[model samples]
Target: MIQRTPKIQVYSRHPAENGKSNFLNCYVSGFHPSDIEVDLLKNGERIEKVEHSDLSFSKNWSFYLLYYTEFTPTEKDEYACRVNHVTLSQPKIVKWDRDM
Candidate 1:
């Protein structure tokens, strides 16, 4: 019985050699029923340029699943990760403002 909402973790990689772009990763974990939907949003809008991995069952917790996505980020861009699960009445949104 899925009792709680998923926890979201957002992070990024710094630009490397040769003028490479920075990458961002959004990880959503500790959820149930593997039928969750994830989206990557830019400036409060959904974008199609995201790459996500399949739900992976946690080795320590059999009933929990984890997912992650990575993408390139633009300067001063605001990124958000949105999650939708059947257990929740509305989607869960986690934002990342890369201002550091």
Candidate 2:
């Protein structure tokens, strides 16, 4: 059976006024099958403390699930969102670019 690989999108919001509360959200969507996993990483290490949203329908159509993760951020932190699914040969990783 062939499945569609998910598309990973990583973006961040503005920094908090108090400093240290900025959030980086990772949106992984447009994939086949509902069995999927997501992980939030900081500086290449897996972060156990992370928040995720429930799998929901995407704007595209049915038969696909959208997964999301939110984490606090620091300017120098190297954040990466790793996605795992049966469709992929390995986990698909999307990194946050500080320059952006």
Candidate 3:
């Protein structure tokens, strides 16, 4: 079993006016043995997968940060990441406009 921290925010690049590609960066933790899977989905459709990387410090924290590159993202959507079938964090919504 693993434990998680408070809600953290992750963001993808702002939707370009010309519809350019964007990338995503999320800060996550509490991954023991590292079997986490990340999915960027919109309206129940998956858009991208994230990659896990090891950090040099905070060994006692035992957490992992995931980063992903979605070739294109243009509107508001939902994103989530799971560790061994258990969601380690809350699903975050990606929005294009700040007013929403």
Candidate 4:
């Protein structure tokens, strides 16, 4: 029971004003494939990272996008992009409103 396909939108063209840049992408359709580990924490450490392996769950479909400018977060920050027990798509906070 491993079907994950969606969350491939992590762009960072010098985005810091809550532009968002935390990522991980993977897909498959059979043939024995299962390996995903993506964790990103700012306030609790564990900065940025991305990973993928084995991958053959259903037959082709993988993607990864983890880009955090080393450090440039001021105000509010909290993220935990996971993909081990099927929990991909939630917990994201970046506050910095200036009428941009």
**Candidate 2 — which pairs collide?**
none
lDDT for position 98 in model 4: 20
TM-score of each: 0.70, 0.72, 0.46, 0.21
Candidate 1 local lDDT, 6-65, one digit each (tens): 777766665566345565666777766667778778888887766546556764343343
For candidate 3, write residues 2-89 as lDDT tens digits: 4444233366564577456565555555544444554544555665444434343255535565555554444564444322323434
**Backbone clashes counted, model 1:** 0
lDDT of 4 by residue, 1-100 (tens): 5455434222224336755642322222221123444344455566544343332222454433343333344446543333332433453323222221
- Candidate 2 per-residue lDDT, tens place, 2-63, comes to 36778877776655664555566677777777678887778989878665565666543424
Order candidates by lDDT, high to low.
Answer: 2, 1, 3, 4
Off by over 4 Å in 1: 2-4, 14-19, 59-75
Record all residue pairs in model 4 with backbone atoms less than 3 Å apart, i.e. clashing.
25-63, 27-61, 28-58, 28-59, 29-57, 29-58, 29-59, 30-57, 30-58
Task: Tell me the RMSD of model 2 versus the true structure.
Answer: 3.6
Candidate 3 residue pairs in clash (backbone atoms < 3 Å)? none
On a 0 to 1 TM-score scale, where does candidate 4 land against the true structure? Answer: 0.21
Candidate 4 total steric clashes: 9
